[PDB]
Ligand binder design. Structure first.
Ligand SMILES: [Mg+2]
Ligand SMILES: [Mg+2]
Ligand SMILES: [Mg+2]
Ligand SMILES: [Mg+2]
Ligand SMILES: [Mg+2]
Ligand SMILES: [Mg+2]
Ligand SMILES: [Mg+2]
Ligand SMILES: [Mg+2]
Ligand SMILES: [Mg+2]
Ligand SMILES: [Mg+2]
Ligand SMILES: [Mg+2]
Ligand SMILES: [Mg+2]
Ligand SMILES: [Mg+2]
Ligand SMILES: [Mg+2]
Ligand SMILES: [Mg+2]
Ligand SMILES: [Mg+2]
Ligand SMILES: [Mg+2]
Ligand SMILES: [Mg+2]
Ligand SMILES: [Mg+2]
Ligand SMILES: [Mg+2]
Ligand SMILES: [Mg+2]
Ligand SMILES: [Mg+2]
Ligand SMILES: [Mg+2]
Ligand SMILES: [Mg+2]
Ligand SMILES: [Mg+2]
Ligand SMILES: [Mg+2]
Ligand SMILES: [Mg+2]
Ligand SMILES: [Mg+2]
Ligand SMILES: [Mg+2]
Ligand SMILES: [Mg+2]
Ligand SMILES: [Mg+2]
Ligand SMILES: [Mg+2]
Ligand SMILES: [Mg+2]
Ligand SMILES: [Mg+2]
Ligand SMILES: [Mg+2]
Ligand SMILES: [Mg+2]
Ligand SMILES: [Mg+2]
Ligand SMILES: [Mg+2]
Ligand SMILES: [Mg+2]
Ligand SMILES: [Mg+2]
Ligand SMILES: [Mg+2]
Ligand SMILES: [Mg+2]
Ligand SMILES: [Mg+2]
Ligand SMILES: [Mg+2]
Ligand SMILES: [Mg+2]
Ligand SMILES: [Mg+2]
Ligand SMILES: [Mg+2]
Ligand SMILES: [Mg+2]
Ligand SMILES: [Mg+2]
Ligand SMILES: [Mg+2]
Ligand SMILES: [Mg+2]
Ligand SMILES: [Mg+2]
Ligand SMILES: [Mg+2]
Ligand SMILES: [Mg+2]
Ligand SMILES: [Mg+2]
Ligand SMILES: [Mg+2]
Ligand SMILES: [Mg+2]
Ligand SMILES: [Mg+2]
Ligand SMILES: [Mg+2]
Ligand SMILES: [Mg+2]
Ligand SMILES: [Mg+2]
Ligand SMILES: [Mg+2]
Ligand SMILES: [Mg+2]
Ligand SMILES: [Mg+2]
Ligand SMILES: [Mg+2]
Ligand SMILES: [Mg+2]
Ligand SMILES: [Mg+2]
Ligand SMILES: [Mg+2]
Ligand SMILES: [Mg+2]
Ligand SMILES: [Mg+2]
Ligand SMILES: [Mg+2]
Ligand SMILES: [Mg+2]
Ligand SMILES: [Mg+2]
Ligand SMILES: [Mg+2]
Ligand SMILES: [Mg+2]
Ligand SMILES: [Mg+2]
Ligand SMILES: [Mg+2]
Ligand SMILES: [Mg+2]
Ligand SMILES: [Mg+2]
Ligand SMILES: [Mg+2]
Ligand SMILES: [Mg+2]
Ligand SMILES: [Mg+2]
Ligand SMILES: [Mg+2]
Ligand SMILES: [Mg+2]
Ligand SMILES: [Mg+2]
Ligand SMILES: [Mg+2]
Ligand SMILES: [Mg+2]
Ligand SMILES: [Mg+2]
Ligand SMILES: [Mg+2]
Ligand SMILES: [Mg+2]
Ligand SMILES: [Mg+2]
Ligand SMILES: [Mg+2]
Ligand SMILES: [Mg+2]
Ligand SMILES: [Mg+2]
Ligand SMILES: [Mg+2]
Ligand SMILES: [Mg+2]
Ligand SMILES: [Mg+2]
Ligand SMILES: [Mg+2]
Ligand SMILES: [Mg+2]
Ligand SMILES: [Mg+2]
Ligand SMILES: [Mg+2]
Ligand SMILES: [Mg+2]
Ligand SMILES: [Mg+2]
Ligand SMILES: [Mg+2]
Ligand SMILES: [Mg+2]
Ligand SMILES: [Mg+2]
Ligand SMILES: [Mg+2]
Ligand SMILES: [Mg+2]
Ligand SMILES: [Mg+2]
Ligand SMILES: [Mg+2]
Ligand SMILES: [Mg+2]
Ligand SMILES: [Mg+2]
Ligand SMILES: [Mg+2]
Ligand SMILES: [Mg+2]
Ligand SMILES: [Mg+2]
Ligand SMILES: [Mg+2]
Ligand SMILES: [Mg+2]
Ligand SMILES: [Mg+2]
Ligand SMILES: [Mg+2]
Ligand SMILES: [Mg+2]
Ligand SMILES: [Mg+2]
Ligand SMILES: [Mg+2]
Ligand SMILES: [Mg+2]
Ligand SMILES: [Mg+2]
Ligand SMILES: [Mg+2]
Ligand SMILES: [Mg+2]
Ligand SMILES: [Mg+2]
Ligand SMILES: [Mg+2]
Ligand SMILES: [Mg+2]
Ligand SMILES: [Mg+2]
Ligand SMILES: [Zn+2]
Lengths: 37, 204, 174, 4, 122
RNA sequence: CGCUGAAAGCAUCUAAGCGGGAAGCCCGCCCCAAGAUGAGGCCUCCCACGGCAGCCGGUAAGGACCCGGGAAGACCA
RNA sequence: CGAUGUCGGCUCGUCGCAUCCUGGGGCUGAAGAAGGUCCCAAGGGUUGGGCUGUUCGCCCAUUAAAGCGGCACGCGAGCUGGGUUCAGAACGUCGUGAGACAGUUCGGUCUCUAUCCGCCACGGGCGCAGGAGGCUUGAGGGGGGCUCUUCCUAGUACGAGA
RNA sequence: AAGUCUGGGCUAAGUGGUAAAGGAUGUGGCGCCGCGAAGACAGCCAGGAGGUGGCUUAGAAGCAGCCAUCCUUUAAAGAG
């Protein structure tokens, strides 16, 4: 998991979701997992 | 959960399997039951125990009435063991077997007014190199204008010992029913002749 | 484009009753009960169940689709049933039943014995395949997930507990 | 004080 | 009861005659070493042309202590000096002989070679 | 990290619901504690005494005073 | 400025968390072991020594780790007095000189009695609707909270081997 | 002290009750293109071929470097 203030899609299989008040990026590539903060 | 009221006798070491075993000898029972605390009546579960017979010409009328509802002799001491409803009306050392672990509660020895070095293992001041009448002193007790005061529970000088102390998980080395004796490996709070309370252990 | 407007086929003979914020699904393999939002409407027709949403606000549209699938999953559960299969993989890895409990031999210093909850039946055809069987779809999936978790697929080798149909993806080592 |  | 600054005699033929403990290799902060414990030490006096020289930082295991060590049978034993045997990082003696009695505690602690070279185990 | 699952026919640990998860948080252990004035509860003892929620004297169950002491203690307790 | 004592040390703590170790995690250019990076986490822990007044820093031997900052650079009505910071003396330097120097060097008076708040302990008083002797419930507080090595599993999983 | 006063609307963050670049399928309201029953977008059922690959390189022949990424039977097929 990367943690930063600019969460962005990285590849076309990246998916921007929002759960429990936080913005996430989930994806088939584990390097692409993101959480804002 | 089970327990009994005792007298601390003294210390010795016996031999068990070519090892020296330090022990404290305790004259536990016999403790007759004097009253039973029930959830219907008092709100909890306990036994009030008696210990040591007393001169009936030394026990006033309020106490005599209490002993009469249970039909027992006058006893010197009355203590409760909580969450214990023994079957009989008398509790003796044979509720313990050798190998069981017990907790023991007594009143530690009283040091009177104790300095911070004896009370809290403080380091004092140096004994030379200029040290000026602070050899056993606590040092600083605070900061400056912030907070401008001294914390509650600050470790300082004052009375020490003669306080309730429980030591926990002592091995019962032997039981001698014929003498109401209970042997216990290690050290027990208080002085010889002090009252102690022996309970089955709570460490699992 | 709409889950919650898709009518729900009900097989013969499955019972469906409506209750305040509840529906009860009685079928051949037992009975479930699906708790539903009071904001939705469950209506019974001829061998058909439907769910109607009161407005087009986003909370009603989100409960609407949810609610339809909840009813449908329960009605399939009491008739056809649900199951999930697990393939164990490894040179020393196997498993067996012990009574109703499930004992795993999967590379630890000990075995792992899994007990089935109420509604879950275990079954081991071959020492390398395990099947979880019951009427509750979500429960069958939780039990299967737990079993898998005890020894997950390896990143580098093809040993561990795999879902049936789960791909084997691995990365190199040197 | 010797504030120098 | 050996601590840093403590001097120890050398109960072997390594060449060292006196060593000064500099560390108690037993944890983060053991105050004292006893029989069967290993120290780090500096060689303060040697005989010429020995396997060790003055100024060597070596390892050794304490084999005798003047503070008396107690025992589970209720007995105790006490020697006149504080003595150790120089070891390598495999706890094996780096000399070929062991002078004077050593305590039986060394056996339990796995220093069997020193124990057998010892002329008396007490 | 999940199960089930829409809004969004797919997907989604979440929007409805349900799991797993820290030497940390709550309780559990040891000690103080009803001046907890919200001053708690149980057992037992004494009791309607004499003179114009008050009053002043003699008593009750009990307590204190004094004294012999105490691994209790500065005095007090 | 009718005075808010000024470095460092010692003693005694307490707090923050941007975490040094220990616990839980995700990613890895993660085979295993061991690391790197980021997230959660402040309960506890975070050693002994050589040099210098030193803070800091380097070095020795360890360690699970040898964290960083705040509290009047925490704490001199608690201690020290090495430094700094009067009066003596000297060196280099500057000044014709008297003298001067966060330049150096050796030396140099640190005040028995706590009134109020606060803190550690211990009593006296009255209260708790009758007065008593016992035995208790626990609202609410406080204490505690660390961690390593070896062995078995098994020289197995993993790895060409180590 | 004086309205749990009246009406329309928004917010779900206790935001309100102290902060910026910048990041986001949070939410409500507008606008403008594109594509669509010449059946779209999603999913699914399908076919997904071949001359056959060349400097490359003991092979990179869709699936290591390159060279342009040439043709095709075709409803379409990328020498990927
Ligand atoms: Mg970026
Ligand atoms: Mg995805
Ligand atoms: Mg004695
Ligand atoms: Mg015996
Ligand atoms: Mg007592
Ligand atoms: Mg005492
Ligand atoms: Mg004592
Ligand atoms: Mg005393
Ligand atoms: Mg003192
Ligand atoms: Mg002490
Ligand atoms: Mg003490
Ligand atoms: Mg002491
Ligand atoms: Mg000291
Ligand atoms: Mg000291
Ligand atoms: Mg001292
Ligand atoms: Mg002195
Ligand atoms: Mg002085
Ligand atoms: Mg002085
Ligand atoms: Mg003084
Ligand atoms: Mg003195
Ligand atoms: Mg001040
Ligand atoms: Mg100050
Ligand atoms: Mg203040
Ligand atoms: Mg006392
Ligand atoms: Mg204590
Ligand atoms: Mg034990
Ligand atoms: Mg006692
Ligand atoms: Mg007594
Ligand atoms: Mg799970
Ligand atoms: Mg010799
Ligand atoms: Mg010798
Ligand atoms: Mg030599
Ligand atoms: Mg020399
Ligand atoms: Mg030399
Ligand atoms: Mg040797
Ligand atoms: Mg021998
Ligand atoms: Mg998934
Ligand atoms: Mg799912
Ligand atoms: Mg779906
Ligand atoms: Mg929810
Ligand atoms: Mg949960
Ligand atoms: Mg839990
Ligand atoms: Mg623990
Ligand atoms: Mg108490
Ligand atoms: Mg009271
Ligand atoms: Mg009480
Ligand atoms: Mg009142
Ligand atoms: Mg009141
Ligand atoms: Mg009241
Ligand atoms: Mg109150
Ligand atoms: Mg009361
Ligand atoms: Mg007294
Ligand atoms: Mg006296
Ligand atoms: Mg007096
Ligand atoms: Mg006195
Ligand atoms: Mg008096
Ligand atoms: Mg001033
Ligand atoms: Mg003045
Ligand atoms: Mg003034
Ligand atoms: Mg001043
Ligand atoms: Mg003044
Ligand atoms: Mg002043
Ligand atoms: Mg000191
Ligand atoms: Mg601090
Ligand atoms: Mg943090
Ligand atoms: Mg960790
Ligand atoms: Mg960690
Ligand atoms: Mg590797
Ligand atoms: Mg690893
Ligand atoms: Mg990591
Ligand atoms: Mg992270
Ligand atoms: Mg911490
Ligand atoms: Mg800390
Ligand atoms: Mg020296
Ligand atoms: Mg020093
Ligand atoms: Mg230094
Ligand atoms: Mg400083
Ligand atoms: Mg420096
Ligand atoms: Mg480590
Ligand atoms: Mg290290
Ligand atoms: Mg250090
Ligand atoms: Mg600091
Ligand atoms: Mg600090
Ligand atoms: Mg400040
Ligand atoms: Mg400053
Ligand atoms: Mg400054
Ligand atoms: Mg200071
Ligand atoms: Mg200061
Ligand atoms: Mg001073
Ligand atoms: Mg100072
Ligand atoms: Mg001060
Ligand atoms: Mg002052
Ligand atoms: Mg002061
Ligand atoms: Mg002051
Ligand atoms: Mg002081
Ligand atoms: Mg000076
Ligand atoms: Mg200097
Ligand atoms: Mg000159
Ligand atoms: Mg001039
Ligand atoms: Mg000139
Ligand atoms: Mg001149
Ligand atoms: Mg000068
Ligand atoms: Mg200066
Ligand atoms: Mg000057
Ligand atoms: Mg200079
Ligand atoms: Mg100078
Ligand atoms: Mg000079
Ligand atoms: Mg000077
Ligand atoms: Mg002098
Ligand atoms: Mg001086
Ligand atoms: Mg004086
Ligand atoms: Mg005063
Ligand atoms: Mg004073
Ligand atoms: Mg004041
Ligand atoms: Mg006061
Ligand atoms: Mg009082
Ligand atoms: Mg009362
Ligand atoms: Mg009363
Ligand atoms: Mg009473
Ligand atoms: Mg009650
Ligand atoms: Mg109590
Ligand atoms: Mg409490
Ligand atoms: Mg209070
Ligand atoms: Mg802990
Ligand atoms: Mg092995
Ligand atoms: Mg095995
Ligand atoms: Mg209103
Ligand atoms: Mg928020
Ligand atoms: Mg707020
Ligand atoms: Mg806010
Ligand atoms: Zn991606």
């Amino acid at each position: 998991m990367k943690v930063r203030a600019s969460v962005k899609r990285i590849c076309d299989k990246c998916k921007v979701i929002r759960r429990h008040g936080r913005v996430y990026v989930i994806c088939e590539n584990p390097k692409h997992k993101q959480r804002q903060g | 959960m089970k327990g009994i009221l005792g007298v601390k006798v003294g210390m010795t070491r016996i031999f068990r399997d070519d090892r020296a075993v330090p022990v404290t000898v305790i004259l536990a029972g016999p403790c007759p039951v004097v009253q039973r605390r029930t959830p219907e009546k008092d709100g909890y579960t306990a036994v009030q125990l008696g210990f040591l017979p007393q001169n009936p010409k030394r026990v006033n009328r309020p106490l005599k009435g209490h002993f009469a509802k249970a039909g027992v002799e006058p006893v010197r001491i009355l203590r409760e063991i909580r969450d214990f409803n023994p079957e009989g009306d008398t509790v003796t050392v044979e509720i313990f077997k050798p190998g069981e672990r017990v907790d023991v509660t007594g009143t530690s020895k009283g040091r009177g007014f104790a300095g911070v070095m004896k009370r809290w293992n403080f380091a004092g001041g140096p004994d030379s190199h200029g040290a000026h009448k602070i050899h056993r002193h606590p040092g600083s007790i605070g900061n400056r204008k912030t907070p401008g005061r001294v914390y509650k529970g600050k470790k300082m000088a004052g009375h020490y010992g003669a306080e309730r102390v429980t030591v926990m998980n002592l091995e019962v080395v032997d039981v001698i029913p014929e003498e109401n004796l209970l042997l216990v490996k290690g050290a027990v709070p208080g002085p010889n002749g002090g009252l102690v309370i022996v309970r089955e252990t709570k460490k699992a | 484009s709409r889950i919650g407007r898709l009518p729900i086929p009900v097989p013969k003979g499955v019972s469906v009753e409506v209750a305040p914020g509840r529906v009860k699904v009685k079928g051949p393999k037992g009975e479930l009960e699906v708790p539903v939002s009071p904001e939705m409407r469950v209506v019974v027709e001829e061998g058909v169940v439907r769910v109607e949403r009161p407005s087009d606000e986003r909370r009603h549209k989100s409960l609407h689709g949810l609610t339809r699938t909840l009813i449908a999953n329960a009605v399939k559960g009491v008739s056809e049933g649900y199951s999930k299969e697990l393939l164990i993989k490894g040179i020393g890895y196997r498993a067996r039943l012990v009574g109703r409990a499930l004992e795993l031999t999967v590379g630890f210093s000990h075995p792992v014995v899994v007990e089935p909850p109420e509604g879950i039946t275990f079954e081991v055809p071959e020492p390398t395949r395990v099947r979880v069987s019951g009427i509750d779809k979500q429960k069958v999936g939780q039990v299967a997930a737990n079993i898998r978790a005890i020894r997950k697929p390896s990143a580098y080798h093809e040993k561990g507990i795999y879902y049936a149909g789960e791909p084997v993806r691995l990365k190199p080592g040197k | 004080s010797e504030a120098c | 009861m050996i601590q840093p600054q403590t001097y120890l005699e050398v109960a072997d033929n390594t060449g060292a005659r006196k060593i000064m403990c500099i560390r108690v290799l037993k944890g983060s902060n053991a105050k004292y070493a006893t029989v069967g414990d290993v120290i780090v030490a500096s060689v303060k006096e040697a005989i010429p042309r020995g396997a060790v020289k003055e100024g060597d930082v070596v390892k050794a295991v304490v084999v005798r202590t003047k503070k008396e060590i107690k025992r589970p049978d209720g007995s105790a034993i006490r020697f006149d000096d504080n003595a150790a045997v120089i070891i390598n990082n495999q706890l094996e003696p780096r000399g070929t002989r062991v002078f004077g009695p050593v305590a039986r505690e060394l056996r339990e602690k796995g220093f069997m070679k020193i124990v057998s070279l010892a002329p008396e185990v007490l």
